[PDB]
């Protein structure tokens, strides 16, 4: 029963521009089993309206999921993605970077 650690990407649908409405995305893939819990934080808290795609997998049977929510990038606010999976001793947090 192989267990793979989830890959995490945190990005924006469009190139970020402070004050301009945008879409924050968190793509978690290559994980197994499919049991997991993704959450979007904004300054240390969780996001209310957070939708995700339907469970699916890739060629090598690796599961992938896309969580997403609307957000307006600023110079002060911090956005991040938190991932809880069995292959993780503690919830992994990936901070959003407009350069990635």
């Amino acid at each position: 029963m192989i267990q793979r650690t989830p890959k995490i990407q945190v990005y924006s649908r469009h190139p970020a521009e402070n004050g301009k409405s945008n879409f924050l995305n968190c793509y978690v893939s290559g994980f197994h089993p499919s049991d997991i819990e993704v959450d979007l934080l904004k300054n240390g808290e969780r996001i209310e309206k957070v939708e995700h795609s339907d469970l699916s997998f890739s060629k090598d049977w690796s599961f992938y999921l896309l969580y997403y929510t609307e957000f307006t990038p600023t110079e002060k606010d911090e956005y991040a993605c938190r991932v809880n999976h069995v292959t993780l001793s503690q919830p992994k947090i990936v901070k959003w970077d407009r350069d990635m």
Partner: protein, 276 residues
């Protein structure tokens, strides 16, 4: 152009918490059009695309019935697997099954897919000839002989050359504007200093379809592998896709690097250079 339709099934057993959860997703190329979750307040084939939502009650009721049959089959397969691998009913397990067909530019069955994995690892797959099977282990061999005894591959072939193809064409015709239109990627180069002596050149390709794309970096027209990074192609959330590739460069050599992008929607392979 060559297209494809595929179904992805995921059944997860959860001892003590009821029946195994079944999740089915339907795809045309890289565009999901249907979904079925057994944990849904109302387990019923749901549409995830506008060019499918217009279908009559027959499509949804029939699709739902078939989906439920599939789920049940996956339950029985879960138990059978518990026998094969000599496993307990108190333990959790996973079964994944992908199966679809590819429509050639002419209209004939190009390729066929029917493969399944158990607990993350390959279980059994239909070979390219669509007539022979490949079992990953001793347990899967039982299934292989089973399907060799009941002529399963033949019937499945009948499915591929039949309903699968016809429905694929129906989908392609009902939504040509979104399924047959390949959009080119918006590409651009960014520069991110990682030191007073090194910098990061990141090549961005955004909002393209389908997902098929190729990004590369070149030092003086060659090809960079050392000090490079390519992230897994990601969805934009609006039916499009993204992908960037970065390279670490000695400060002052940025103008010696070129990003090359190959995509279906591009007339000619793009070549970008950092232009601040």
């Amino acid at each position: 152009g060559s297209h494809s339709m595929k179904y992805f099934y995921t059944s997860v057993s959860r001892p003590g918490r009821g029946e195994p959860r079944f999740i089915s997703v339907g795809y045309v190329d890289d565009t999901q059009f249907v979904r079925f979750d057994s944990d849904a307040e109302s387990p019923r084939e749901e549409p995830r695309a506008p060019w499918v939502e217009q279908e009559g009650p027959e499509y949804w009721e029939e699709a739902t019935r078939r989906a439920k049959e599939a789920a049940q089959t996956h339950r029985e397969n879960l138990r059978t697997a518990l026998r094969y691998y000599n496993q307990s009913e108190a333990g959790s397990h996973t079964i994944q099954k992908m199966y679809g067909c590819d429509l050639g530019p002419d209209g004939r069955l190009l390729r066929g897919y029917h493969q399944s994995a158990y607990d993350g690892k390959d279980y059994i797959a239909l070979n390219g000839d669509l007539r022979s099977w490949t079992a990953a282990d001793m347990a899967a061999q039982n299934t292989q002989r089973k399907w060799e005894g009941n002529r399963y591959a033949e019937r499945f072939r009948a499915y591929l050359e039949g309903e699968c193809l016809e429905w694929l064409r129906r989908y392609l015709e009902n939504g040509k504007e979104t399924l047959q239109r390949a959009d080119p990627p918006k590409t651009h180069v960014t520069h991110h200093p990682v030191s007073d002596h090194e910098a990061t050149l990141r090549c961005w390709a955004l909002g393209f379809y389908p997902a098929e794309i190729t990004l590369t970096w070149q030092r003086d027209g060659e090809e960079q592998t050392q000090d490079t990074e390519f992230v897994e192609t990601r969805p934009g959330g609006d039916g499009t896709f993204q992908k960037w590739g970065a390279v670490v460069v000695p400060s002052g050599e940025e103008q010696r690097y070129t990003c090359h992008v190959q995509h279906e929607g591009l007339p000619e392979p793009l070549t970008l250079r950092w232009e601040p």
